[PDB]
Amino acid sequence: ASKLPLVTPHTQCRLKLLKLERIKDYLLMEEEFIRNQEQMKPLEEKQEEERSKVDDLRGTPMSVGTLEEIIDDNHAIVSTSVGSEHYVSILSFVDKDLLEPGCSVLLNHKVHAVIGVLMDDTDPLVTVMKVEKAPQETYADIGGLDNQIQEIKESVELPLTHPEYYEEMGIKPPKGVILYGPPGTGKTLLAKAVANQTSATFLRVVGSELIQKYLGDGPKLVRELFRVAEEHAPSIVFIDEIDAIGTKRYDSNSGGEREIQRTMLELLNQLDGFDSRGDVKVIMATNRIETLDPALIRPGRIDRKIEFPLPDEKTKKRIFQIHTSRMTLADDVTLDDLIMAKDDLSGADIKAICTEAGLMALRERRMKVTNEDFKKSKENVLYK
Amino acid sequence: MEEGGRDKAPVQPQQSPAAAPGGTDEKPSGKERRDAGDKDKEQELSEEDKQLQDELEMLVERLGEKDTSLYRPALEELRRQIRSSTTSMTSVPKPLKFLRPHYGKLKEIYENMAPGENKRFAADIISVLAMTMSGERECLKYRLVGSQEELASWGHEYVRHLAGEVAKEWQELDDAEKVQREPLLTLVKEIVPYNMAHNAEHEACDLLMEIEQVDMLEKDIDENAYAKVCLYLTSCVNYVPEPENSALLRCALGVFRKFSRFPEALRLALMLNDMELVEDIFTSCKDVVVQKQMAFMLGRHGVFLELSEDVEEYEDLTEIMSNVQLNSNFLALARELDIMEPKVPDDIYKTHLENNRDSARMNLASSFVNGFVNAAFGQDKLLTDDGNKWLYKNKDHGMLSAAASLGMILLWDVDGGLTQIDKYLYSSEDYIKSGALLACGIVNSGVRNECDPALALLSDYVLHNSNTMRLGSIFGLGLAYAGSNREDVLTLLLPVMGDSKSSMEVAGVTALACGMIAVGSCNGDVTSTILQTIMEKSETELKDTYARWLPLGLGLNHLGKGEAIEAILAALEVVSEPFRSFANTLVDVCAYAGSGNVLKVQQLLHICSEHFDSKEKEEDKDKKEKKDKDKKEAPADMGAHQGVAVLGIALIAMGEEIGAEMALRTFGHLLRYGEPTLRRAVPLALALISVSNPRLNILDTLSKFSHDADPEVSYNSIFAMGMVGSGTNNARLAAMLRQLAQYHAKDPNNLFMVRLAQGLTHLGKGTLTLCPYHSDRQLMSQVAVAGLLTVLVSFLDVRNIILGKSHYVLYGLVAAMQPRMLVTFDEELRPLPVSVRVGQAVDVVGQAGKPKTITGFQTHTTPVLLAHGERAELATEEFLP
Amino acid sequence: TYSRQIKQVEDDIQQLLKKINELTGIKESDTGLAPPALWDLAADKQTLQSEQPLQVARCTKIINADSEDPKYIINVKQFAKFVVDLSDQVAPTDIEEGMRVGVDRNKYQIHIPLPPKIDPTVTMMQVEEKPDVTYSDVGGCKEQIEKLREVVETPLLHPERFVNLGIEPPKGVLLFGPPGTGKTLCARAVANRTDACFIRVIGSELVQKYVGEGARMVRELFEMARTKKACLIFFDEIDAIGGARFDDGAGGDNEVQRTMLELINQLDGFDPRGNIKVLMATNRPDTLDPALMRPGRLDRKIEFSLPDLEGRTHIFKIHARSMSVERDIRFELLARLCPNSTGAEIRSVCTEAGMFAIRARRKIATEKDFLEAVNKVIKSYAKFSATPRYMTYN
Ligand SMILES: Nc1ncnc2c1ncn2[C@@H]1O[C@H](COP(=O)(O)OP(=O)(O)OP(=O)(O)O)[C@@H](O)[C@H]1O
Ligand SMILES: Nc1ncnc2c1ncn2[C@@H]1O[C@H](COP(=O)(O)OP(=O)(O)OP(=O)(O)O)[C@@H](O)[C@H]1O
Ligand SMILES: [Mg+2]
Ligand SMILES: [Mg+2]
Incomplete structure (x- = not known):
């Protein structure tokens, strides 16, 4: 039970040995002291006699109730399941430290006195936004970028893995990171790699579902999200396509455009309120950064901004090398011809072309991939 | 896996030993050639400390172990050539060749004869080749040899030389933290005979390296926090010459010799002081050493600094007499009053606006409102209206206490305290004059000046025919002379307690006053006290007023000595019936202020744990627990947690009278830091009333709830207590307790000192002037007699937290430092980190922080002390272009 | 060496524990x-003795009291209403109509008075704790700090100068300025220093799903506020x-206006709140309603503007006094290199130089690090700033 953390010698030094011997002697003496009374003046079993008495005191059925208010001198107002509430007392074996407003408590059947307190039962939301397993392979699968990878590592991994560099110079790590660029260039992929490598709990949510269909539901959802992220542990919060709330409008929204503003104000508070934030990291990503509110991106809320440019031809060759690593590729094909098939093709077109060529070869019950397959695949995927 | 072909080590180095039985005879050349080739091959393959799993060191015992069994013992014709290549090579693998209990069978290869200079091929190895074998030899074989047969065979003659060569070799290759591994073999070798081991190692360490000394010193003091009685007496005397011979500190000696002053011998302290006076070159180091030598680490040192050149250097003691005291008073007046502190804040109870939504007893607490916040020359003119009006109406004891409180108001004064006292002294009252004299004795506390040793207080004493003005004439003088060992006041006060008069309380307080002055010699006081106790307590069975007062003087006269001979003499001197034997557990433990006596700790409870306590020896177990509170003030941060766990699981959880009445009085002795663990354990035991037990006891617990000074943010909690004290816990017994607890938090203001541990772990007296408060607050219902007076200034051993500054000859520089957390770093790496709080940087001489270490910058290098002293000189130098 | 001994002695002592x-x-x-x-x-x-001597004591709400020798009417929210009387242990004075009371379960007679509803989602708004900033960090x-201090905290500390002089101090205060300037941080410092309540409210929490809700929460907020001194x-x-x-065309943004009207009413008219001081801070004050900005509700209008020149050097000194830096760097030049900037950008400058x-x-x-930090976070991240369009408060 955390008796002594000072074992910093961590060796065969006489200091650690003497400390351990003294700890053993103290434990033995206290064990003798705590056993002598059970040998000389037992007066009860005290292992199951007290338990039997307690079980006799509480009835065999016990109901659940909601606390509403508690007085210090061991009583409170408890609302029954139907709704009518009483002024019952509190027993002594209830460990009055989990007594909080809103927690389900176990009441007696006859006099409704509080006899126990009950643990809760998770939430539906937590499963919805809790990432369980690492998706796929780490930064060795990316290629091409190699520049902002170090920036992301500096922001999220390094403060956790080596929290000693910062303390020597006495600075706080940069707080926020946002990723912008044209569509289909590898932002969510970098997020997946970070999720695989990291050790903290990872929470993901898309921006398109921050807008609800009633009044005042959006701020509620935001508050619950950061409450969950706070109450676990060091964690990472990932929000994707934020601009989706400012671009598309839905008639299912009960309000107009002002409830969007209310949700925005709530989010701004949560990022930089006057409460103690704790230990939470935020990652944001979008492809239309010229529309969202500049008050949301000021320094102190988001400190790093990383641009993802279009791939270059060296990176194009590297990507083609990556995506046909395990393909039984025939010797006739050449990647150079495919490199300038389109002037400004992005990362996703490479994978699309490769997969479509694979499917086309799969139709003819074959194993190798020929030139005409690639030639038809590019027309199928690009020119509609 | 692949085997064979490349597996040449399991073939040639296995067939040569296999044919060694056939090559032993009729083959003289091969017997040496193959032996040398195996030795050289194994040595070359064992020279690198990366391939631990050698192809030869482990593949040889599979079949060559039986060969070696038939080689060394079964040859009977050993020569002068084969043995050097045989024993030196069979001693390397044999530690791991056999099973786990191999330590007892090292004499079949290596202890027979050491071949030459085996260290030649063991110099490149650290803890693998033979220094592990050396530690194996020293662990059991040398241990069993030296337990009773120190004079023995070769296992003691040249083994010491080999141990010395191994220890020297340890700090040769890498000089890593393995230097701390050197004592592991040094302590294991001749444990109790550590004196000659350290004497041999001192010359080696002196010529080893200068830098490699300070770390070893630190490790030494780390192993000085606890040791066996003989081991302590040996190590604490052996570590003395380290900073003088090898290192040239010349300033950390006296500060770090408090562990070697009382425990070793007072003559060692005298000779250390003489050596410090001998090295008078710095003429600054000496000032820093002598600054903290009267009320900080020890006292009664103004009897050795009166040599022939008392001009500026040897005359410095005179400035330590009172000039430094006046300088400290001026520092308090300038750096505290002029910065933040007003003259009279007096408003902690005047924040009762929130509470909303007449007895004179509370007026006593009003005095506590004035005195506590008006410390350090908080003199108030016409702000004592309450005391002036109520000193002549009621509460004779309370009025005496209020009169005495003016002395605590004027703390550490020599200028005009008596002049201010004279305003109210001439009143011809039964209690005004006594309280005024107690305040006067408080005022000159620590000054030890020629204010009134036998002039003022003795004038009131010689008329010892009054209830007060005769009792209230010895506490102040004793407090002002607590740190001195002058025998004139001793001979003057001896007839006071030897008067055999009807003044019971006066003799009791005389015992307390006289005990807190001397701690060493003068057995005549012991004899007089013991004979008065024999002729008083024997023919009576009254209350414990004598019990808590007479033996306390003896304990103070026998405090701080681990020899235990004094305890044996005291115990056997006063052998009597158990009620008469109330002092059996007082003097025995009083000599155990700070030490490691886990055996004694468990034997304390072995005699009687509970025994069902049939209302027979309640006070016996009470005092036994009270004395069991010891060893927790400076347990080196180890025993305290176990002790608090034991108290929680044993006393409070189940008990009869010890657990439910005074079990929490331990926390006051435990520590005054303040941790949420106790800050919640105490509230859990205090918020609930539980009128079932002697309610007053719980009240006493509240009196020690805020024993921790240094105010913090949970103070509002105590205000909440006031709410439950409004209706419940009737004020007639707890109004003074709640008020004094409330304003004790900020009673220090920003100046605090009530922990009794300075520098590293040297307590530094204090106990003498602290213990009486705890040993007198056993029963709080006795406050009526003089509860106001006793508390009013029992904790007069307040030294302040103001320490770091400049103290330069001109004292021009104010402060250029940087505060941070504690700085103790284990030798995991030679580069060390210790403070995890570099976030703060201040340049003021304000509060120094309780768990706080302060460093410097701007190329100062701190060439004065660099270790400890709380009065850093801040020498300036710029030898770094 | 003796690892097999120490390890087993540790494991065996752990098992014994x-x-x-x-x-x-x-x-x-x-x-x-x-x-x-603990519960023995x-x-x-x-x-x-804690089971039979005590009973459930249902909670009810009184309606009215018939006069002289008294009979009372009782209401519970699923059972019926009743006509009842008191017991011998309760005085007839402290039973004013409109307060919850305790009632026996069989004879139905009044026992004890009770406090009113507080609505837990409003109970949570009390800070109950304090942050760690101080005036020395602003x-x-x-x-502005002095102007705010002589309104929020000085009258409570010394409420004797004003009474003698006959002046009634102002009650409200407003703080406005461009983003990243120091409003919320100043509020945190105030919350840390004070000693009374500190009830924090975020505006966006007052939006509710149903009709006639936000006004309620405003009412209970001011009730709980009046409970204290x-x-x-x-x-x-x-x-x-x-x-x-x-309002025009179809009624839109109408219920929120009702909430605003209730907030206005609670601050003025027919015995105002008395001893309660409010403090609001905003971002774009050009959209506030004229009825709200009238003095008597918002006596003071402190404005936070971009630091001029001494503010920049002072902020640099505060934010860089706890790091390992070279001995001869000059911050005045760095202050001159960033004309119009806020404290947030200066904090970012320091952190980026450290990185x-x-x-x-x-x-x-070294100084080169600070120069690169300034030349990257001020001049390259300039396509993403709020200060050009919020200095016109739009
Ligand atoms: N730099 C790259 N390295 C490797 N694969 C890439 C790269 N860029 C794109 N791809 C491929 O394109 C796919 C698209 O990736 P992803 O959808 O994560 O990109 P994105 O630009 O973040 O998308 P969006 O903007 O639409 O959210 C990846 O799964 C991968 O197969
Ligand atoms: N005068 C200042 N002194 C010290 N730090 C400052 C100052 N002004 C701003 N800062 C720093 O810059 C940031 C300002 O954030 P703050 O929460 O105070 O802004 P705000 O006024 O609430 O902004 P917004 O209305 O945009 O939310 C904090 O990191 C704070 O430490
Ligand atoms: Mg994406
Ligand atoms: Mg803000």
């Missing part, structure tokens, strides 16, 4: 059970709770 703890009792997985050494008191007396705007309310991001009354020093290998930064 676990065994003795199990002997004391920590097993038999609990569903809300206290340690057996509830063994003989509480079982038979350098650059001393005038004297304490403070903080309103953050007002510009989300009410702009102006403009540049960590980047390669060093342990102490």
Whole structure:
């Protein structure tokens, strides 16, 4: 039970040995002291006699109730399941430290006195936004970028893995990171790699579902999200396509455009309120950064901004090398011809072309991939 | 896996030993050639400390172990050539060749004869080749040899030389933290005979390296926090010459010799002081050493600094007499009053606006409102209206206490305290004059000046025919002379307690006053006290007023000595019936202020744990627990947690009278830091009333709830207590307790000192002037007699937290430092980190922080002390272009 | 060396400790059970003296009182109403109509009075704790700090100068300026320093799903505020709770206007709140409603502007005084290099310079690091700033 953390010698030094011997002697003496009374003046079993008495005191059925208010001198107002509430007392074996407003408590059947307190039962939301397993392979699968990878590592991994560099110079790590660029260039992929490598709990949510269909539901959802992220542990919060709330409008929204503003104000508070934030990291990503509110991106809320440019031809060759690593590729094909098939093709077109060529070869019950397959695949995927 | 072909080590180095039985005879050349080739091959393959799993060191015992069994013992014709290549090579693998209990069978290869200079091929190895074998030899074989047969065979003659060569070799290759591994073999070798081991190692360490000394010193003091009685007496005397011979500190000696002053011998302290006076070159180091030598680490040192050149250097003691005291008073007046502190804040109870939504007893607490916040020359003119009006109406004891409180108001004064006292002294009252004299004795506390040793207080004493003005004439003088060992006041006060008069309380307080002055010699006081106790307590069975007062003087006269001979003499001197034997557990433990006596700790409870306590020896177990509170003030941060766990699981959880009445009085002795663990354990035991037990006891617990000074943010909690004290816990017994607890938090203001541990772990007296408060607050219902007076200034051993500054000859520089957390770093790496709080940087001489270490910058290098002293000189130098 | 001994002595002592703890009792997985050494008191007396001498004592709400010798009318929210009387232990004075009381379960007679509803979602708004900033960390705007201090905290500390002089101090205050300037941080410092309540409210929390809800929460907020003697309310991001009354065409943004009207009414008219001081801070004050900005509700209008020149050097000194830096760097030049900027950008400058020093290998930064930090976070991240369009408050 955390008796002594000072074992910093961590060796065969006489200091650690003497400390351990003294700890053993103290434990033995206290064990003798705590056993002598059970040998000389037992007066009860005290292992199951007290338990039997307690079980006799509480009835065999016990109901659940909601606390509403508690007085210090061991009583409170408890609302029954139907709704009518009483002024019952509190027993002594209830460990009055989990007594909080809103927690389900176990009441007696006859006099409704509080006899126990009950643990809760998770939430539906937590499963919805809790990432369980690492998706796929780490930064060795990316290629091409190699520049902002170090920036992301500096922001999220390094403060956790080596929290000693910062303390020597006495600075706080940069707080926020946002990723912008044209569509289909590898932002969510970098997020997946970070999720695989990291050790903290990872929470993901898309921006398109921050807008609800009633009044005042959006701020509620935001508050619950950061409450969950706070109450676990060091964690990472990932929000994707934020601009989706400012671009598309839905008639299912009960309000107009002002409830969007209310949700925005709530989010701004949560990022930089006057409460103690704790230990939470935020990652944001979008492809239309010229529309969202500049008050949301000021320094102190988001400190790093990383641009993802279009791939270059060296990176194009590297990507083609990556995506046909395990393909039984025939010797006739050449990647150079495919490199300038389109002037400004992005990362996703490479994978699309490769997969479509694979499917086309799969139709003819074959194993190798020929030139005409690639030639038809590019027309199928690009020119509609 | 692949085997064979490349597996040449399991073939040639296995067939040569296999044919060694056939090559032993009729083959003289091969017997040496193959032996040398195996030795050289194994040595070359064992020279690198990366391939631990050698192809030869482990593949040889599979079949060559039986060969070696038939080689060394079964040859009977050993020569002068084969043995050097045989024993030196069979001693390397044999530690791991056999099973786990191999330590007892090292004499079949290596202890027979050491071949030459085996260290030649063991110099490149650290803890693998033979220094592990050396530690194996020293662990059991040398241990069993030296337990009773120190004079023995070769296992003691040249083994010491080999141990010395191994220890020297340890700090040769890498000089890593393995230097701390050197004592592991040094302590294991001749444990109790550590004196000659350290004497041999001192010359080696002196010529080893200068830098490699300070770390070893630190490790030494780390192993000085606890040791066996003989081991302590040996190590604490052996570590003395380290900073003088090898290192040239010349300033950390006296500060770090408090562990070697009382425990070793007072003559060692005298000779250390003489050596410090001998090295008078710095003429600054000496000032820093002598600054903290009267009320900080020890006292009664103004009897050795009166040599022939008392001009500026040897005359410095005179400035330590009172000039430094006046300088400290001026520092308090300038750096505290002029910065933040007003003259009279007096408003902690005047924040009762929130509470909303007449007895004179509370007026006593009003005095506590004035005195506590008006410390350090908080003199108030016409702000004592309450005391002036109520000193002549009621509460004779309370009025005496209020009169005495003016002395605590004027703390550490020599200028005009008596002049201010004279305003109210001439009143011809039964209690005004006594309280005024107690305040006067408080005022000159620590000054030890020629204010009134036998002039003022003795004038009131010689008329010892009054209830007060005769009792209230010895506490102040004793407090002002607590740190001195002058025998004139001793001979003057001896007839006071030897008067055999009807003044019971006066003799009791005389015992307390006289005990807190001397701690060493003068057995005549012991004899007089013991004979008065024999002729008083024997023919009576009254209350414990004598019990808590007479033996306390003896304990103070026998405090701080681990020899235990004094305890044996005291115990056997006063052998009597158990009620008469109330002092059996007082003097025995009083000599155990700070030490490691886990055996004694468990034997304390072995005699009687509970025994069902049939209302027979309640006070016996009470005092036994009270004395069991010891060893927790400076347990080196180890025993305290176990002790608090034991108290929680044993006393409070189940008990009869010890657990439910005074079990929490331990926390006051435990520590005054303040941790949420106790800050919640105490509230859990205090918020609930539980009128079932002697309610007053719980009240006493509240009196020690805020024993921790240094105010913090949970103070509002105590205000909440006031709410439950409004209706419940009737004020007639707890109004003074709640008020004094409330304003004790900020009673220090920003100046605090009530922990009794300075520098590293040297307590530094204090106990003498602290213990009486705890040993007198056993029963709080006795406050009526003089509860106001006793508390009013029992904790007069307040030294302040103001320490770091400049103290330069001109004292021009104010402060250029940087505060941070504690700085103790284990030798995991030679580069060390210790403070995890570099976030703060201040340049003021304000509060120094309780768990706080302060460093410097701007190329100062701190060439004065660099270790400890709380009065850093801040020498300036710029030898770094 | 003797690892096989020390390791086993540790493991065996750990097992002995676990065994003795199990002997004391920590097993038999609990569903809300206290340690057996703590509830041993509830063994003989509480079982038979805290069970029968006490009863459930239903909670009811009184309606009115028939006069003289009294009969009362009782209401409960699922059972019926009743006509009842008191007991011998309750005086007829402290039973004013409109307060919850305790009633027996069989004879139905009144026992004890009770406090009113507080609505837990409003109970949570009390700060109950304090942050760790201080006035010493808000350098650059001393005038505004002094102006606010002589309203929020000085009258409570010394409420004797004003009474003698006959002046009634102002009650409200507003703080406005461009983003990243120091409003919320100044509020945190105030919350840390004070001693009364500090009830924090975010504007966006007052939006509710149903009709006629936000007004209720405002009512209970001011009721709980009046319960104490004297304490403070903080309103953050007002510009989300009410702009102006403009109703046209189809009724839109109408219920929020009702909430704003209730907030206005609670501050003025027919015995105002008395000893309650409010404090609101906003971002774009050009949209606030004219009825709200009238003095008597918002006596002071402190403005936070971009630091001029001394503010920049002072902020640099505050934010860089706890790091390992070279001995001869001059911050005045850095102040001159960033004309119009806020404290947030200066904090970012310091952190980025530290990161540049960590980047390669060093342990102490140099002036080149600060120059690169300024030339990257001020001049390259300039396509993403708010200050050009919020200095016109639009
Ligand atoms: N730099 C790259 N390295 C490797 N694969 C890439 C790269 N860029 C794109 N791809 C491929 O394109 C796919 C698209 O990736 P992803 O959808 O994560 O990109 P994105 O630009 O973040 O998308 P969006 O903007 O639409 O959210 C990846 O799964 C991968 O197969
Ligand atoms: N005068 C100042 N002194 C010290 N630090 C300052 C000052 N002004 C701003 N800062 C720093 O810059 C940041 C300002 O954030 P703050 O929460 O105070 O802004 P705000 O006024 O609430 O902004 P917004 O209305 O955009 O939410 C904090 O990191 C704070 O430390
Ligand atoms: Mg994406
Ligand atoms: Mg803000």
